[PDB]
Design an enzyme around this catalytic site. Structure first.
Site, short mmCIF file in Angstrom:
data_model
loop_
_atom_site.label_atom_id
_atom_site.label_comp_id
_atom_site.label_asym_id
_atom_site.label_seq_id
_atom_site.Cartn_x
_atom_site.Cartn_y
_atom_site.Cartn_z
N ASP F 43 0.84 -1.19 0.00
CA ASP F 43 0.00 0.00 0.00
C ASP F 43 0.88 1.25 0.00
O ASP F 43 2.08 1.16 0.27
CB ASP F 43 -0.91 -0.01 1.23
CG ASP F 43 -2.17 0.80 1.04
OD1 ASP F 43 -2.45 1.20 -0.11
OD2 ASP F 43 -2.89 1.05 2.03
C1 LIG Z 1 1.81 5.26 20.92
C2 LIG Z 1 0.33 5.12 20.61
C3 LIG Z 1 -0.17 6.01 19.46
C4 LIG Z 1 -1.67 5.82 19.08
C5 LIG Z 1 -2.43 7.13 18.72
C6 LIG Z 1 -2.49 7.50 17.21
C7 LIG Z 1 -3.56 8.56 16.81
C8 LIG Z 1 -3.36 9.27 15.44
C9 LIG Z 1 -4.62 9.34 14.52
C10 LIG Z 1 -4.60 10.43 13.42
C11 LIG Z 1 -5.60 10.24 12.25
C12 LIG Z 1 -5.36 11.18 11.08
O1 LIG Z 1 -4.43 11.94 11.08
S1 LIG Z 1 -6.50 11.15 9.63
C13 LIG Z 1 -5.62 11.19 7.99
C14 LIG Z 1 -6.28 12.14 6.98
N1 LIG Z 1 -7.25 11.54 6.04
C15 LIG Z 1 -7.37 10.19 5.72
O2 LIG Z 1 -6.62 9.38 6.25
C16 LIG Z 1 -8.44 9.75 4.72
C17 LIG Z 1 -8.25 10.19 3.24
N2 LIG Z 1 -7.09 9.57 2.62
C18 LIG Z 1 -7.20 8.62 1.58
O3 LIG Z 1 -8.35 8.35 1.23
C19 LIG Z 1 -5.93 7.96 0.93
O4 LIG Z 1 -6.34 7.72 -0.36
C20 LIG Z 1 -5.48 6.60 1.57
C21 LIG Z 1 -6.69 5.78 1.96
C22 LIG Z 1 -4.63 6.91 2.79
C23 LIG Z 1 -4.60 5.71 0.54
O5 LIG Z 1 -3.32 6.06 0.54
P1 LIG Z 1 -2.15 5.48 -0.77
O6 LIG Z 1 -3.09 4.67 -1.63
O7 LIG Z 1 -1.71 6.81 -1.31
O8 LIG Z 1 -1.12 4.69 0.00
#
Ligand SMILES: CCCCCCCCCCCC(=O)SCCNC(=O)CCNC(=O)[C@H](O)C(C)(C)COP(=O)(O)O
Ligand SMILES: CCCCCCCCCCCCCCCCCC(=O)OC[C@H](COP(=O)([O-])OCC(O)COP(=O)([O-])OC[C@@H](COC(=O)CCCCCCCCCCCCCCCCC)OC(=O)CCCCCCCCCCCCCCCCC)OC(=O)CCCCCCCCCCCCCCCCC
Ligand SMILES: CCCCCCCCCCCCCCCCCC(=O)OC[C@H](COP(=O)([O-])OCC(O)COP(=O)([O-])OC[C@@H](COC(=O)CCCCCCCCCCCCCCCCC)OC(=O)CCCCCCCCCCCCCCCCC)OC(=O)CCCCCCCCCCCCCCCCC
Ligand SMILES: CCCCCCCCCCCCCCCCCC(=O)OC[C@H](COP(=O)([O-])OCC(O)COP(=O)([O-])OC[C@@H](COC(=O)CCCCCCCCCCCCCCCCC)OC(=O)CCCCCCCCCCCCCCCCC)OC(=O)CCCCCCCCCCCCCCCCC
Ligand SMILES: CCCCCCCCCCCCCCCCC[C@@H](O)O[C@H](CO[C@H](O)CCCCCCCCCCCCCCC)COP(=O)(O)OCC[N+](C)(C)C
Ligand SMILES: CCCCCCCCCCCCCCCCC[C@@H](O)O[C@H](CO[C@H](O)CCCCCCCCCCCCCCC)COP(=O)(O)OCC[N+](C)(C)C
Ligand SMILES: CCCCCCCC/C=C\CCCCCCCC(=O)OC[C@H](COP(=O)(O)OCCN)OC(=O)CCCCCCC/C=C\CCCCCCCC
Ligand SMILES: CCCCCCCC/C=C\CCCCCCCC(=O)O[C@H](COC(=O)CCCCCCC/C=C/CCCCCCCC)COP(=O)(O)OCCN
Ligand SMILES: Nc1ncnc2c1ncn2[C@@H]1O[C@H](COP(=O)(O)OP(=O)(O)O)[C@@H](O)[C@H]1O
Lengths: 98, 347, 54, 320, 104, 88, 459
Positions: F43
């Site tokens: 991925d």
């Molecule tokens: C130590 C413990 C830690 C635990 C805590 C962690 C908490 C952090 C959570 C933060 C969440 C965010 O930032 S949310 C991130 C912002 N938005 C998204 O993730 C959705 C939209 N992206 C897409 O649809 C892409 O197409 C994709 C599916 C990625 C495909 O990627 P490739 O096909 O290009 O590889």
């Protein structure tokens, strides 16, 4: 000689070796210098008291005064070194070679 | 630094040296050394930079260790004889401590490592002071206790100083390190004759101080600290380069220049004591010092190195500050060989 | 025909930090033109304190 | 009594002469802008000493007789042939740039010496701080090499850090088409060849590096082409500025004494211009160097120290 | 620039005969050249060589060779007029020599 | 002296080492020409982790725009060679 | 002796106060006058030396050397002024000052009564020569040549200083008269062996001895014309003069301490004569010929016979004059064609007949044609060697044959054949060059009429 004389002389020798052998901290070496001065003070005081030489009872005080001058000088230099590098490590003082 | 503060510090350094000179009590000599170091540390740091800070720190550590050894030797001598006068030490162990302490203060081999680094890390004025005035006090102390020194240790340190000075100076492109190694070799030459004649040591001290003062002043006048920077002086001040070349030949000990007389007198005095091998090795080794002096003279005056375009602007300006004693020092560094019998006035 | 004089290539022999360059000292760099090294980015971290709630 | 440690110890001080009107002022701008007229007007209004922009022969104006010397004995560069052939393989472009930087450093030293010795203020056209815009324009136009830029940066780093920046930075803003139009209306045949890309590079360098950099340690007054003719308005704007930003308020007698010791002794000022970096554009061989030095020494008043050349009418030499 | 440095080109050596067809090879200035030739010739060939050679040839006999010849003539005449040997194998008188008394 | 004159073979070996140390890759089905997205089935997020591992291995940062182009080990090796100025 | 030293010193302010266009004329005139004055020292007493004062004395050995130095100075000035025409006035005055200082040191060296003063002046001669070679030499190898010349000399000279101070401590004096009158034999011991070596090796390396001669080709080839003149004519003779002065106190040790030096000198004169046969540089051939002649002089000094010292003195004088003439002859062609390669310019007899005559006379004197003083010295040395051992004649004859071979080889290569076509800048010989050759050659031939002036004290 009394065995206390040997003990004080070995204290001086140990402090001198500690100064001559360097670990990371500059401060540790200043303490070794102060220890050499302390051993010198003790030895000179014992020698002066044993022989009842009245006039040199003031000599160790002068020794202490110039020891304080040396310690102040070393601390000032340590301040400048740590301000330069953020640490008092001796391995940072390698800009100048032979 | 406030000029008044600088004057006070220089006067304090000189007064500590004079206290070492005029004292009959070992404690007062130690006090003079302490005062000299205390006033000397800021002078190395007048122009603030990390290199100056490092040089001052190394100098302080070395001199403080030497002072501790000095005091310990004085205390041993007091222990084995209730004496404070500087006449002749009564204990061989205390005398060995004293010798090691004074050699570390002078920078004799194998305690030479601090001299080139401290000299490189400071300005040319501080280098001049360090390599001229700082030698007087330990040399005076060694002169007073000459009859007590062990000739083997002193001569070993002197020979090591000469050899290491030559070898270290062979490898330098910075002028301050060249002068520091030259100083180490000259200190070795001076301490080689001390167990036999202190007048020879005094004469060598005077001539070396004169030559070193002339050389440092010539280096300040042509504000260069590297070989290539000094290579440009011919296109702005040819007279300075010619005087530098003559002074360098004098420092190499070539006749009929002044630098030859101390080596000549030391060799003849040592031969009076049935010492033949060591003076021969000493001269054959000073050949190395002459070699790197000749390299500097080749790069500075005897050939013409390429220059830059901006030197034309420097052509239009004179020197704002002039050194009063530079002319006298050059003449004394070169043309004083015929006045050799005047050394009797030194004893 | 004129007397030979040193050129840039000849002069560059003395421009290194040390003569007789070896493998170890090849990485030595000549000191700065003025005796001033550039300040290090040794950022002194401030102390972080929890003032309260209790 | 020549100024020195002795003069500073007894009496002489710098801060006692500062009278709120010292205010080192530089009036910068692009090529052919009316910055010179504005700077002269500001100097006349505020009563400050005016410094015309340092050229190739600025050093000639301050030594000996104020007459310029020949180009091969002073400068060894030509601005006209930089316009004609900026890409010539003789290194004229970077030689001109480095000589002009050295001249501006000398002029800055002279202006600082004047202000610190008399208290009266000075007005400069350009400075060592704004000299780099021409260097960047030349480099972006393919006129100089990367090594020339590196050497310039080394020289600037070892030289410009010794001095205090100007109190007031005045920037005359003229758009590049107006600059070009003024260029054709001027009449100089060489300046006709200045391309629009070069002026655009100069202006971009100004507006992206110089003004943002000086705005952190100086106060900047920007003026358009039309509003730059009002000298009275500009002077009134300067007179109501609070200089509480740069290092000038952080200066006491000791720093002023060090700076005054440095600004005089022009040899110490120029020390690091002739560093042994062997760029072909500025390196001169031993034979040419010797010939040009001898020719310079054959100049009528240059063989000896100023008051010792009898062929220009010096007298009582045997008693001097 | 594809160049390493700003250097004057190496000039061609100039013939002294080109501006002075009779130039003696001493100087560019014809008068100084002529007088250099004259002083060299006069003080070398006229003063040193001839006069000095005459002086050396007429040096007084300080080496005592004529005196030695006359002394030898006197000694030989005296010695063979009396039947004495012309020379002794002993340079110094044996009567003023005191050898060690015993050889064994 | 400092580190020896790093060559292409060492760079390629280190890249294959750090890729074989990545758990979501078959140790024997991975080749220098394998495509992460198509050949290995990785991925985009997986690729970002791989780029981060490369940055840890070779001790220099990689911008995103350069990282998005890097779709096989050979491209990574070529990029490292270009950034470190290595011809062989 | 002050009547010689003081005018030589006066030469300095006189040339520093002269006009820019009169320095050569004034220096040449007054140098010739000083040579004329110094010519008066040839009147020798026979029995003992001329002891002017406590500091200086004149001998039958010193006087020809002093006259040769004083005569060589004007020839050096005449040879120098051509290639120094483009120089500034100050640098030309500095060059003349170097020459005058060298003359002063040389004239004081040959007359000192005491060995430490002799050593001081004999070392002081180094500095002007080094400055001349390294400042006014033409090529880039002059720096290496100067380093060789300085360090080869000093490595030998420093032990001499140690030995001299030790000898003065043990005996109480180093004055040459006291040294000679109070001479005592040197025993057979390691200490005496090393004292002998320390007293000998400095003069050995100044000759130079074969195996210690590597500095000479470098220094003599890389120096300007005046430097080569003074190196070959005078400075090589310092070693021989020092040996003659110092071997008085070395007996009877020299009887076997001289064996390796005699072997080295004979075989190395053969080697250097052979080397001259394959040389592409014209100055190196002259340098190696000088080495061979000085090897013969070393043999003459080592064997310690009156005939040997007489031959050695004659050979020193003759070699000085001949080598100076040969160097000047080579320099003329070098100034013409700006190259030292021998085969570059050929058939010069067709273009320069009088210079070809000078070349022929110099080559004839180099091979020691009778009755020139060169053969006088060589024949005296060969006879003394034959008395020393009858087997030396093989090496002497081989050296004579090879010397004639390379002398005529140089003459034929440079003067005969056909001219090089493309070389078209060979101008007619100047009056200065012809006068210089004549002033070299005429004293050589005039000395034949009075050989006893250069035969030395043993005469
Ligand atoms: C130590 C413990 C830690 C635990 C805590 C962690 C908490 C952090 C959570 C933060 C969440 C965010 O930032 S949310 C991130 C912002 N938005 C998204 O993730 C959705 C939209 N992206 C897409 O649809 C892409 O197409 C994709 C599916 C990625 C495909 O990627 P490739 O096909 O290009 O590889
Ligand atoms: C014999 C052995 C052979 C010779 C010895 C070896 C010689 C080496 C000497 C090196 C000296 C170093 C030096 O001074 O500058 C280097 C200097 C190079 O520096 P520079 O590039 O020219 O510029 C530096 C500037 O000064 C940049 O600095 P600045 O801008 O701040 O300028 C300030 C300047 C201008 O100065 C001023 O402004 C004057 C203002 C006066 C201020 C008032 C202050 C007074 C209050 C303090 C009192 C202290 C008393 C101490 C009490 C002790 C109690 C125990 O002052 C100085 O430069 C230094 C002043 C030196 C003071 C000398 C006075 C002698 C003191 C004697 C003390 C002994 C007392 C008795 C002892 C009894 C025993 C206990 O070298 C030279 O200039 C030439 C060399 C000369 C050497 C001497 C010649 C040989 C002997 C003759
Ligand atoms: C040239 C340019 C090109 C380049 C040049 C290169 C050269 C550069 C040279 C540089 C300068 C060199 C300086 C050297 C200075 C030398 C001075 C010197 O030492 O003089 C010594 C010496 C002087 O001796 P002295 O120690 O003064 O003697 C004093 C006596 O106690 C007492 O003596 P006396 O009482 O018997 O007095 C005799 C008196 C008077 O004697 C007579 O008058 C009687 C003669 C007989 C006449 C009989 C017939 C006439 C009368 C009868 C006829 C008329 C009446 C009858 C009519 C009848 C009609 C039918 O006249 C003389 O004293 C002799 C003449 C002396 C001339 C000396 C000239 C030296 C010049 C020095 C500088 C030269 C520079 C070069 C230019 C020279 C000028 C051109 O002069 C000679 O050695 C002359 C040599 C004579 C040789 C005789 C033949 C020997 C042949 C043997 C060899 C056989 C094989 C073939 C060999 C052929 C070789 C040619
Ligand atoms: C022995 C004969 C006696 C004759 C009596 C008069 C002699 C006066 C001569 C004075 C010394 C000559 C000066 C040499 C410099 C060159 C002059 C020149 O440039 O020519 C311009 C002049 C103008 O001609 P040009 O038409 O304009 O064009 C000329 C071209 O450049 C090209 O012209 P080039 O190709 O014809 O070359 C010029 C000529 C000149 O080149 C030379 O090489 C001539 C110099 C001879 C060799 C020098 C080194 C060898 C060692 C001998 C040392 C002897 C010194 C004795 C004292 C001399 C006093 C200064 O070369 C030769 O002729 C061939 C040289 C072969 C000579 C072989 C001789 C071996 C020994 C013979 C005996 C020596 C001792 C005598 C006593 C013995 C027992 C009784 O030409 C001549 O005048 C020719 C010179 C005359 C030839 C002399 C040959 C023998 C003389 C030897 C010394 C005299 C001893 C006197 C004592 C009494 C007997
Ligand atoms: C170019 C054209 C050439 C053709 C023309 C040629 C003309 C003829 C040439 C042939 C001439 C032959 C001359 C033969 C000699 C005749 C004169 C000779 O007999 O005098 C000699 C005289 O010679 C001189 O004494 C020796 C020459 C001295 C040389 C000094 C030169 C000046 C110094 C120059 C510098 C030297 C530097 C090197 C010095 C070490 C020998 O003297 P002597 O038989 O005893 O005297 C007896 C009577 N006395 C004693 C009373 C005088
Ligand atoms: C390239 C040119 C350079 C210059 C050349 C200089 C030449 C220097 C050579 C010196 C000549 C000889 C030196 C001493 C003479 C005899 C040496 C020795 O071999 O002879 C025997 C000595 O016996 C043994 O051989 C001792 C010497 C052995 C140790 C020396 C090492 C030689 C190896 C060669 C090294 C190269 C030296 C030169 C370096 C460049 C004689 O036996 P003996 O009668 O009982 O001893 C006499 C001495 N006494 C009276 C004090 C007792
Ligand atoms: C025990 C110690 C004894 C000490 C003896 C010292 C001998 C004195 C000679 C010193 C020679 C030093 C040569 C040296 O160090 O480097 C060799 C040098 C390095 O070149 P640099 O100019 O420094 O750098 C250029 C590139 N940047 O390389 C050379 O080419 C050297 C050329 C000149 C060498 C001259 C040597 C002459 C020696 C003559 C024989 C006697 C020497 C002394 C020992 C005698 C034997 C006992
Ligand atoms: C550039 C090349 C030239 C090289 C020439 C170098 C050779 C110089 C000759 C030897 C130098 C040292 C001589 C020492 C000075 C002599 C003084 C003397 O005679 O004292 C001796 C001392 O003798 C020595 O100490 C000599 C020992 C050698 C010391 C240095 C050795 C270095 C190598 C020596 C061999 C090489 C010399 C010849 C080589 C020539 C060049 C290859 C005896 O004194 P006392 O102790 O009182 O003894 C009597 C009472 N018991
Ligand atoms: N640092 C520099 N580099 C190149 N050219 C410069 C530099 N400084 C000034 N000049 C030249 O100065 C010329 C005119 O100066 P400018 O101040 O712009 O016009 P004005 O004379 O109206 O004040 C311009 O052709 C410009 O190129």
């Amino acid at each position: 000689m009394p065995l206390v004389y040997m003990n004080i002389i070995m204290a001086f020798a140990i402090a001198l070796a500690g100064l001559l052998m360097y670990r990371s901290h500059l401060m540790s070496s200043l303490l070794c210098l102060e220890g050499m001065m302390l051993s010198l003070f003790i030895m000179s005081t014992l020698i002066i008291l044993n022989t009842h030489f009245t006039l040199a009872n003031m000599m160790p005080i002068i020794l202490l005064v110039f020891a304080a001058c040396e310690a102040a000088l070393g601390l000032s230099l340590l301040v400048m070194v740590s301000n330069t590098y953020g640490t008092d490590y001796v391995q940072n003082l390698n800009l100048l070679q032979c | 630094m406030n000029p008044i503060i600088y004057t006070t510090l220089i006067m304090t350094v000189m007064s500590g040296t004079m206290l070492v000179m005029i004292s009959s009590h070992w404690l007062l000599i130690w006090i003079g050394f302490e005062m000299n170091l205390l006033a000397m540390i800021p002078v190395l740091m007048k122009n603030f930079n990390p290199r100056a800070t490092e040089a001052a720190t190394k100098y302080f550590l070395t001199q403080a260790t030497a002072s501790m050894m000095l005091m310990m030797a004085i205390i041993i001598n007091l222990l084995y004889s209730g004496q404070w006068t500087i006449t002749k030490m009564f204990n061989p162990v205390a005398m060995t401590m004293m010798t090691m302490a004074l050699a570390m203060k002078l920078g004799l081999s194998p305690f030479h490592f601090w001299v080139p680094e401290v000299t490189q890390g400071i300005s040319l004025q501080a280098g001049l002071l360090l390599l001229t005035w700082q030698k007087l006090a330990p040399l005076s102390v060694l002169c007073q206790i000459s009859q007590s020194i062990n000739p083997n240790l002193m001569l070993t340190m002197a020979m090591l100083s000469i050899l290491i000075g030559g070898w270290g100076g062979l490898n330098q492109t910075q002028l301050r390190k060249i002068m520091a190694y030259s100083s180490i070799a000259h200190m070795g030459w001076m301490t080689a004759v001390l167990p036999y004649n202190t007048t020879m040591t005094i004469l060598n001290l005077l001539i070396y101080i004169t030559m070193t003062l002339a050389m440092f002043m010539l280096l300040i006048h042509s504000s260069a600290t590297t070989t290539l920077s000094l290579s440009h002086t011919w296109n702005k001040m040819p007279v300075i380069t010619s005087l530098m070349m003559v002074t360098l030949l004098s420092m190499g000990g070539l006749p009929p220049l002044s630098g030859f007389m101390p080596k000549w007198m030391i060799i003849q005095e040592m031969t009076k004591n049935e010492s033949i091998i060591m003076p021969t090795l000493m001269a054959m080794t000073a050949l190395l010092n002459l070699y790197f002096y000749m390299r500097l003279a080749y790069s500075s005056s005897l050939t013409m190195f390429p220059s830059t375009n901006n030197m034309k602007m420097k052509w239009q300006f004179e020197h704002t500050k002039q050194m009063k004693l530079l002319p006298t020092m050059i003449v004394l560094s070169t043309l004083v060989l015929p006045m050799t019998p005047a050394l009797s006035s030194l004893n | 025909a004129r007397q030979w004089q040193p050129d840039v290539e000849w002069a560059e022999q003395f421009g290194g930090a040390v003569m007789y360059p070896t493998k170890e000292t090849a990485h030595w760099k000549p000191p700065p033109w003025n005796d001033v090294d550039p300040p290090k980015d040794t950022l002194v971290s401030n102390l972080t304190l929890n003032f309260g709630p209790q | 009594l020549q100024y020195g440690p002795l003069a500073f110890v007894l009496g002489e001080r710098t801060t006692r002469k500062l009278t709120e009107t010292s205010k080192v002022i530089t009036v910068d701008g692009n090529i052919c802008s009316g910055k010179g007229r504005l700077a002269r007007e500001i100097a006349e209004k505020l009563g400050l000493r005016h410094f015309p922009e340092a050229g190739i022969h600025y050093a000639d104006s301050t030594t000996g007789d104020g007459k310029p010397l020949d180009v091969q004995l002073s400068g060894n560069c030509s601005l006209e042939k930089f316009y004609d052939d900026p890409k010539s393989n003789d290194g004229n472009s970077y030689r001109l740039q480095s000589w002009l930087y050295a001249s501006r450093l000398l002029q800055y030293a002279d202006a600082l010496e004047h202000l610190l010795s008399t208290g009266q203020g000075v007005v400069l056209e350009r400075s060592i701080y704004s000299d780099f815009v021409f260097l960047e324009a030349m480099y972006r136009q393919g006129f100089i090499r990367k090594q020339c830029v590196e050497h310039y940066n080394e020289v600037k780093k070892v030289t410009a850090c010794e001095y205090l920046p100007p109190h007031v930075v005045v920037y005359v803003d003229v758009p590049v088409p107006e600059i070009q139009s003024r260029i054709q209306k001027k009449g100089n045949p060489h300046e006709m060849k200045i391309t629009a890309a070069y002026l655009q590079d100069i202006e971009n360098a100004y507006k992206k590096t110089f003004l943002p950099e000086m705005s952190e340690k100086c106060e900047v007054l920007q003026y358009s082409a039309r509003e730059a003719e009002d000298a009275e308005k500009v002077v009134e704007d300067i007179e109501y500025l609070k200089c509480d930003k740069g290092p000038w308020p952080d200066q006491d007698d000791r720093t002023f004494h060090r700076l005054r010791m440095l600004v005089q002794n022009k040899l110490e000022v120029l020390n690091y211009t002739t560093i042994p970096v062997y760029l072909p554009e500025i390196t001169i061989g031993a034979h040419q160097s010797d010939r040009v030095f001898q020719k310079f020494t054959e100049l009528p008043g240059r063989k000896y120290s100023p008051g010792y050349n009898e062929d220009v009418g010096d007298k009582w030499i045997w008693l001097k | 620039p594809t160049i390493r440095l700003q250097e004057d080109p190496d000039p061609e050596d100039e013939n002294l005969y080109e501006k002075n067809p009779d130039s003696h090879g001493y100087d560019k200035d014809p008068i100084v050249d002529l007088w250099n030739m004259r002083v060299v010739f006069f003080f070398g060939f006229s003063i040193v060589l001839v006069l000095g050679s005459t002086f050396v040839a007429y040096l007084p006999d300080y080496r005592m060779q004529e005196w030695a010849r006359r002394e030898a003539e006197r000694l030989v005449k005296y010695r063979e007029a009396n039947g004495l040997p012309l020379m002794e194998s002993n340079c110094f008188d044996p009567n003023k020599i005191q050898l060690p008394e015993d050889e064994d | 002296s400092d580190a020896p004159p790093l060559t292409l073979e060492a760079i390629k070996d280190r890249v294959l080492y750090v890729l074989k140390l990545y758990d979501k890759i078959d140790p024997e089905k991975l080749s220098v020409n394998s495509h992460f997205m198509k050949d290995l089935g990785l991925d985009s997020l997986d690729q970002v982790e791989i780029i981060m591992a490369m940055e840890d291995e070779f001790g220099f940062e990689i911008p995103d725009i350069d990282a998005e182009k890097l779709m096989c080990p050979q491209e990574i090796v070529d990029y490292i060679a270009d950034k470190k100025d290595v011809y062989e | 002796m002050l009547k010689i030293i003081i005018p030589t010193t006066m030469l300095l302010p006189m040339t520093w106060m002269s006009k820019h266009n009169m320095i050569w004329i004034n220096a040449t005139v007054h140098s010739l006058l000083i040579s004329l004055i110094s010519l008066s020292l040839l009147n020798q007493l026979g029995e003992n030396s001329l002891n002017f004062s406590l500091t200086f004395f004149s001998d039958s050995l010193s006087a020809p050397l002093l006259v040769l130095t004083t005569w060589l100075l004007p020839l050096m000035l005449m040879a120098s002024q051509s290639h120094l025409s483009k120089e500034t006035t100050t640098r030309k005055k500095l060059y003349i000052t170097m020459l005058i200082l060298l003359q002063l040191f040389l004239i004081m060296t040959f007359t000192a009564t005491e060995l430490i003063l002799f050593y001081i002046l004999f070392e002081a001669t180094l500095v002007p020569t080094l400055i001349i070679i390294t400042r006014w030499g033409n090529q880039t190898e002059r720096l290496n040549a100067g380093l060789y010349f300085l360090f080869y000399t000093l490595a030998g000279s420093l032990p001499l200083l140690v030995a001299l101070v030790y000898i003065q401590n043990t005996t109480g004096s180093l004055n040459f008269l006291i040294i000679h009158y109070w001479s005592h034999p040197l025993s057979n011991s390691w200490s005496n062996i090393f004292m002998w070596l320390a007293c000998i090796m400095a003069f050995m390396v100044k000759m130079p001895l074969y195996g210690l001669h590597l500095w000479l080709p470098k220094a003599h080839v890389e120096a300007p014309i005046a430097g080569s003149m003074v190196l070959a004519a005078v400075l090589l003779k310092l070693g021989g003069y020092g040996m003659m002065r110092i071997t008085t106190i070395l007996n009877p040790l020299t009887n076997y301490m001289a064996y390796p030096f005699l072997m080295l000198s004979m075989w190395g004169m053969i080697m250097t004569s052979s080397i001259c046969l394959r040389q592409t540089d014209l100055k190196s051939l002259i340098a190696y010929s000088s080495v061979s002649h000085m090897a013969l002089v070393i043999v003459a000094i080592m064997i310690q016979t009156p005939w040997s010292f007489m031959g050695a003195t004659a050979l020193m004088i003759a070699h000085g004059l001949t080598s100076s003439m040969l160097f000047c002859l080579a320099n003329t062609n070098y100034e013409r064609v700006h190259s030292r390669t021998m085969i570059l310019a050929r058939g010069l007899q067709t273009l320069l007949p009088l210079m070809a005559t000078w070349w022929l006379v110099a080559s004839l004197t180099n091979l020691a044609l009778p009755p020139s003083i060169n053969l006088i010295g060589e024949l005296f040395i060969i006879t003394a060697s034959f008395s020393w051992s009858n087997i030396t004649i093989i090496l002497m004859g081989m050296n004579m044959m090879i010397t004639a071979l390379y002398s005529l080889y140089m003459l034929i290569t440079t003067q005969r054949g056909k001219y090089t076509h493309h070389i078209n800048n060979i101008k007619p010989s100047f009056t200065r060059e012809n006068a210089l050759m004549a002033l070299h050659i005429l004293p050589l031939l005039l000395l034949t009429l009075n050989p006893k002036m250069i035969l030395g004290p043993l005469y």
